[PDB]
């Protein structure tokens, strides 16, 4: 049975814990990969965690200087939900230093980019059989979401970036069926910057919130349908979401708000409910520490700084990182609504602490329409390890 | 459903990455076998990696002097594609120091040779049940392909060698059904030398490219049908494929071209497309370092040294080794063409570096008719290990 279309998001009041890895706590004595950018994707029968490995084990000599991302040794693998990414639990998926993957009900589609900096190549597989390839069109680092793609009515949709990291770039939407590309569209967004988009299905369209790495401290959004016609804009609230960001103030949803702290950013997410918005953001204005979920009842049509409730995930004394959004659909649960969920990455090592490596673990939450609570679920490892001395 | 016959190879323009193990990088702290000669074989539902183990773990006291091949401890095992050959991931297949194995759609046939140097015995199993045995007929080391066999229309075909390694030998073709030998034929090839043949299905026949350890620096080929009638010859191009080899010059396809560097060799492969050929060869003329794929548009009918495009797999500063060919068929993909793929072994340890052991890892590529790129995918281990000091 394939993931149909037309079902709206589902009414919620809070977020309930779903999973925790405890990966770096186990990698102190066990065999655990050195991973980063872990995302979660669900299909008709199970939910899995995909991650990008550096090709080395934690607490080893080969994890020396694993802060660097592009290398011929990274691979994309996957394991069941909530289980430590061990060599005995993980299933090989693809060869890549940038990747994404979703499901269309029965099977798995994966996209993985590898190659030199100037002529990188993306390989598209469906159930382990190579079905397509795409090549860079601007001669600069070509990269993708690092979170799940959206697959509805047998068609899967992704967005791909190419070009400079501090100027105008160039963007494509890809529409894929059963593993091979059937269409693509060039997004004309003069004055924008889309990177690392998080996408979810709403109504009969796809809704994505991306990252502005050039001069923006709020987040840009794109919305498109199955004919690849797009609307673009910025989140219109005054409660900024990027990192680093200035103090809360006047927002704008026709263009970026810089205020001196636009350059750089982190992967993030927001969920739209009519006129309101749920914004996921870190607690510190300069570093990646803490995490909270803010509910703004006018966040999509008004530029004020006032809000209507805050629930906290990680306190201000602990490290966070990337965050992303996924969905659990009515073919699994049995409802007529789509359940929204999110995941958070937690980074340990360089550049902020005194080690030779860098790794990350994850936690995952799902939205519910009932009583919930706010607490702190940090990483909890005691660094440095044995190899660092 | 059984693998039918009649479908031709499939039109290609380049090669796209399929898998990487990262086995020696993980064996530095994890539990990984000491393997060598790893090949890949695919069936109707999955692709697996078969390998020959020395019976010891890497970074252990028992891995001392594992450069020697024939011993009562080697075994043939298999694991899923792209996964480290761990004791917790591997499935026992057979007892052998030389072996091969294929699939005929539903199941697995394996052949494994074991015993003394003069009275070795090959055991044939189908799905783990011993169905046949064969015994050496010339009283000298009896050996087989170390890559997959070709199984079409329920019948499986192999080629087996016996005799001296620097003089005339003796060759048989074996035709097997559901695990037991139904026919065999004696190849009369006065002046030839076939070892470690790589075979693929073309048209209604089987096409194999082999290795010469007596006086050839090009590669010999054999072609046969289901009645075991054979044509034999040499690859007719002037771009030599063996290792060691002389500089490129005038070739010949009626007999071997020695030019002083014929003795010895490595397992290799070539794919034939009408009049042209894809040749897989190493970059260094004396050692096993580097690897590239050369396309020669007259390589099967002409003896010139000119070519029409080169794509590189491993650069000249890194170690390579054996290489082999396999196929992915239209019952899996769903096309009317057979997809050609190859794999490369990467050897670390003695005789070239300062350790007490010898092991190898693998990479695998498949052919596609679209845009691709050339890069380097080396091994990446940092030798020597702890046990070597």
């Amino acid at each position, epitope marked *: 049975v394939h993931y149909s279309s037309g079902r709206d998001l589902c009414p919620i009041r809070g977020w309930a814990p779903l999973s925790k890895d405890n990966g770096i706590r186990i990698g102190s004595r066990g065999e655990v990969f050195v991973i980063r950018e872990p995302f979660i994707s669900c299909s008709i029968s199970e939910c899995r965690t995909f991650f990008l490995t550096q090709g080395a084990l934690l607490n080893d000599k080969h994890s020396n200087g694993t802060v*660097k*991302d*592009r*290398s011929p040794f990274r691979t994309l693998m996957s394991c069941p939900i909530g289980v430590a990414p061990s060599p005995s639990n993980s299933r090989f998926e693809s060869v890549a230093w940038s990747a994404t993957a979703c499901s269309d009900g029965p099977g798995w589609l994966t996209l993985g980019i590898t190659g*030199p900096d*100037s002529t990188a190549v993306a390989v598209l597989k469906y159930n382990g059989i190579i079905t397509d390839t795409l090549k860079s069109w601007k001669g*600069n680092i070509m990269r993708t979401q690092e979170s799940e793609c959206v697959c509805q009515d047998e068609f899967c949709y992704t967005l791909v970036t190419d070009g400079p*990291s501090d100027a105008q770039a160039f963007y494509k939407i890809l529409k894929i069926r059963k593993g091979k590309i059937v269409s693509m569209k060039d997004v004309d967004a003069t004055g924008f910057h889309f990177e690392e988009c998080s996408c979810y299905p709403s109504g009969t369209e796809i809704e994505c919130v991306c990252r502005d790495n050039w001069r923006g401290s709020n987040r840009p959004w794109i919305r498109f349908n199955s004919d690849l016609d797009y609307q673009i804009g910025y989140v219109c609230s005054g409660i900024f979401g990027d990192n680093p960001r200035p103090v809360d103030g006047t927002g704008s949803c026709n263009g970026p708000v810089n205020n001196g702290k636009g350059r750089y950013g982190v992967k993030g997410f927001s969920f739209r409910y009519g006129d309101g918005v749920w914004i996921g953001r870190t607690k510190s204005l300069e570093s990646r520490s803490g995490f909270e979920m803010v509910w703004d009842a006018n966040g999509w049509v008004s530029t004020d700084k006032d809000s209507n409730g805050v629930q906290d995930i990680i306190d201000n004394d602990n490290w966070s990182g990337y965050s992303g959004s996924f969905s659990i659909r009515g073919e699994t649960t049995g409802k007529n609504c789509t359940v929204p969920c999110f995941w958070v990455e937690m980074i340990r090592g360089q550049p902020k602490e005194k080690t030779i490596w860098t790794s990350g673990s994850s936690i995952a939450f799902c939205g519910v329409n009932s009583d919930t609570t706010g607490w702190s679920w940090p990483d909890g490892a005691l660094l440095p390890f044995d190899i660092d001395k | 459903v059984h693998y039918s016959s009649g479908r031709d190879l499939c039109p290609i323009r380049g090669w796209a990455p399929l898998s990487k193990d990262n086995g020696i990088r993980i064996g530095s702290r994890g539990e990984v076998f000491v393997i060598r000669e790893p090949f890949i074989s695919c069936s109707i539902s999955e692709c697996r990696t078969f390998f020959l183990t020395q019976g010891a773990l890497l970074n252990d006291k028992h891995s001392n002097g594992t450069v020697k091949d024939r011993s009562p401890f080697r075994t043939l095992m298999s694991c899923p594609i792209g996964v480290a050959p761990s004791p917790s991931n591997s499935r026992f297949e057979s007892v052998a120091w030389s072996a091969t194995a294929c699939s005929d759609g539903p199941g697995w046939l394996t052949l494994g040779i074991t015993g003394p140097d003069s009275t070795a015995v090959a055991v044939l199993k189908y799905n783990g049940i011993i169905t046949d045995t064969l015994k050496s007929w010339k009283g000298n080391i009896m050996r087989t392909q170390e890559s997959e066999c070709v199984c079409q229309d329920e019948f499986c075909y192999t080629l087996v060698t016996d005799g001296p390694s620097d003089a005339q030998a003796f060759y048989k073709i074996l035709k097997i059904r559901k695990g037991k030998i139904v026919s065999m034929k004696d190849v009369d090839a006065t002046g030839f030398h076939f070892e470690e043949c790589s075979c693929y299905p073309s048209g209604t026949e089987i096409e194999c490219v082999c290795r010469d350890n007596w006086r050839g620096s090009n590669r010999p080929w054999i072609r046969f049908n289901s009645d075991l009638d054979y044509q034999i010859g040499y690859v007719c191009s002037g771009i030599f494929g063996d290792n060691p080899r002389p500089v490129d010059g005038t070739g010949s396809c009626n007999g071997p071209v020695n030019n002083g560097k014929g003795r010895y060799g490595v397992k290799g492969f070539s794919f034939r497309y009408g009049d042209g050929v894809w040749i897989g060869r190493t970059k260094s003329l004396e050692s096993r370092s580097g690897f590239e794929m050369v396309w020669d548009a007259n390589g099967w009918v002409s003896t010139d040294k000119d070519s029409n495009g080169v794509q590189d797999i491993i650069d000249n500063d890194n170690w390579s080794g054996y290489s082999g060919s396999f196929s992915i068929r239209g019952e899996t993909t769903g096309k009317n063409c057979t997809v050609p793929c190859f794999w490369v072994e990467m050897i670390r340890g003695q005789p070239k570096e300062k350790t007490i052991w010898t092991s190898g890892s693998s990479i695998a590529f498949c052919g596609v008719n679209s845009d691709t790129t050339g*890069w*380097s995918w080396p091994d990446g281990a940092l030798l020597p290990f702890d046990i070597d000091k």
Partner: nanobody
Amino acid sequence: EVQLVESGGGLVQPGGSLRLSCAASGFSFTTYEMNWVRQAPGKGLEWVSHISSRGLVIYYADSVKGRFTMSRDTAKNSLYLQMDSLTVADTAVYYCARHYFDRDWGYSGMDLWGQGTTVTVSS
């Protein structure tokens, strides 16, 4: 064993030309960014030139503009500096140095240096 080795230094009469080379081992030029730096006799370091992982030549110092040409070759892992119309103000020691660009943090810093080569211009 990551390392860099310079070659091509020597003595040149004013108005001449030279061609310096830097040969690398242990890594690839398809992922890293390269730099030519120099030290004058008795003075501090001066940044001369910078080339990207993609081949673009991002920067040239104003003093060496119009007379110097930076180039590379990835098939042999070599870097070349072609210098023409030399002045007595170019006597120095030259180093090739390496650094990186990350797409999450960005532009780490020069952590690998070559041993350096010497050039003199006089009569």
